[PDB]
Amino acid sequence: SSKLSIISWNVDGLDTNNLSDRARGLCSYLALYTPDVVFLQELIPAYVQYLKKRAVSYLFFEGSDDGYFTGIMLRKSRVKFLESEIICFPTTQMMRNLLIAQVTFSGQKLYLMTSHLESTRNQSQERTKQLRVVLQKIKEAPEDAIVIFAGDTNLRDAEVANVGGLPAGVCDVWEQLGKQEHCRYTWDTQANACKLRFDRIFLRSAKTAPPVTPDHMALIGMEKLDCGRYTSDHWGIYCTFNT
Ligand SMILES: [Mg+2]
């Protein structure tokens, strides 16, 4: 299938309760869908070590080797790796940054990006500054590339409005697919009364190919594991693109 598939998920590695069982759960979801790209946030070393032992068909990239951090997985049979980098968030208080992988997908260049934007309500200012950095990097990416950003943005209220909205040619995939209610809230204290759309996917086409449109989006991980807990306090996002 010419369609690109991705999963994005904050794995809640800062919650050590039943972390091994929940990492097993995450791996089972990744295997079931076998996505072309995985964007992960809030990994810890023991967590990524576990995933690497089980997912040897994927290339791994991490946002750090200490504390907690993001990661990108690339399905090796489907995605050819070119290079990677980390862009620093100079005023983060929580070690946040921007992890980027450049690949080719059936001859088409893709820039793949993930971040775990600053957490907590009162860091709204710093989170907004980080969002501006992300949107600038999306806009500035080489024009022969499709850009996909997926991550835990921690966004709420009108923080996106405060940065000026999205740049020209950049869309929010959930919005683009019609703001469907069934896959709207990714963090839900009732079902996991506070429901928020923290996890978001931003998309920009390449100038050198027809516009990329999102095809389908769904939330995953909504089934309690044998241990009686969910894989994460976030739902994961599964999304495909008409490439
Ligand atoms: Mg957490």
UniProtKB/Swiss-Prot annotation:
Q: Where is this site: Interaction with 5' end of substrate DNA?
A: Y68, W187, F198, H234
Needed cofactors? Mg(2+); Mn(2+)
What biological function has been recorded for the protein in this entry? DNA repair enzyme that can remove a variety of covalent adducts from DNA through hydrolysis of a 5'-phosphodiester bond, giving rise to DNA with a free 5' phosphate. Catalyzes the hydrolysis of dead-end complexes between DNA and the topoisomerase 2 (top2) active site tyrosine residue. Hydrolyzes 5'-phosphoglycolates on protruding 5' ends on DNA double-strand breaks (DSBs) due to DNA damage by radiation and free radicals. Controls gastrulation movements and left/right (L/R) axis determination via smad3-mediated regulation of cdh1/e-cadherin.
Tell me which family the UniProt entry assigns to this protein. Belongs to the CCR4/nocturin family. TTRAP/TDP2 subfamily.
Coiled-coil parts of chain: none
Region (Interaction with 5' end of substrate DNA): which ranges? Answer: 10-14, 116-121, 154-156
As one GO molecular function, the record gives:
manganese ion binding
Binding positions (Mg(2+)): D12, E42
Name the chain's protein: Tyrosyl-DNA phosphodiesterase 2
Which keywords label this protein? Developmental protein, DNA damage, DNA repair, Hydrolase, Magnesium, Metal-binding, Nuclease, Nucleus
Q: In which tissues is it expressed?
A: Expressed ubiquitously during blastula stages and throughout gastrulation. Shortly after shield formation, expressed weakly in dorsal forerunner cells (DFCs). Between somite stages 5 and 9, expressed in the tailbud and around the Kupffer's vesicle at a higher level than the more uniform expression in the embryo.
**Cofactor: record remark:** Binds 1 magnesium or manganese ion per subunit.
Active site: residue positions: D152 (proton donor/acceptor)
Domain of life according to the entry? Eukaryota
Q: What are its E.C. numbers?
A: 3.1.4.-
Q: Which gene encodes it?
A: tdp2
Report the main location listed first in the record: nucleus
The answer to keyword DNA damage applying to this record is yes
The listed locations are:
Nucleus; Nucleus, PML body
One biological process term in Gene Ontology: determination of left/right symmetry
EC class of this enzyme? hydrolase
- Determine if Nucleus is one of this entry's keywords: yes
